[PDB]
């Protein structure tokens, strides 16, 4: 499985194009704020939303703590999707600069 740190993810903002981020937390959690540009698809619904993922692209998956997102990454890869886990989750990403 592939993974990157939150520090690495933030520095990605300084790159040419924005990366694809998928926030798999639940509704009330995302209600507290999300990373600008992130798509919200709860983990439980990932199996029914495979059509969202473009096979030619890569998706960075984030959750509250980093474990559940890793589970989603493995699931996605085993279904032909390119995914990377964001280590530490939103806990480590922090509550600064989020979209409310
Ligand atoms: Na959504």
TrEMBL record:
<feature type="domain" description="Rhodanese">
    <location>
        <begin position="15"/>
        <end position="97"/>
    </location>
</feature>
<protein>
    <recommendedName>
        <fullName>Rhodanese domain-containing protein</fullName>
    </recommendedName>
</protein>
<dbReference type="InterPro" id="IPR050229">
    <property type="entry name" value="GlpE_sulfurtransferase"/>
</dbReference>
<dbReference type="InterPro" id="IPR036873">
    <property type="entry name" value="Rhodanese-like_dom_sf"/>
</dbReference>
<dbReference type="InterPro" id="IPR001763">
    <property type="entry name" value="Rhodanese-like_dom"/>
</dbReference>
<dbReference type="Pfam" id="PF00581">
    <property type="entry name" value="Rhodanese"/>
</dbReference>
